[PDB]
């Protein structure tokens, strides 16, 4: 409970980092697709 309360900012930060990385990867993949079309 208290341990979960202390670890919740870390879990939220990790999830935010994961979402940021995944969005960046999808963005880069679409850019590579545009490069291949070119």
């Amino acid at each position: 409970q208290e341990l979960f309360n202390e670890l919740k900012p870390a879990v939220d930060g990790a999830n935010f980092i994961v979402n940021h990385m995944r969005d960046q990867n999808n963005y880069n993949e679409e850019k590579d697709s545009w490069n291949r079309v070119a």
Binding site: E6, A10, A14, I17
Partner: peptide
């Protein structure tokens, strides 16, 4: 638990930097 506290701080700092980069 100073080690876990410092790890929480590092993860929060990384997330804050990425959020600032997102706003930029």
């Amino acid at each position: 638990l100073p080690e876990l506290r410092e790890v929480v701080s590092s993860i929060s700092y990384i997330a804050r930097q990425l959020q600032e980069q997102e706003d930029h």
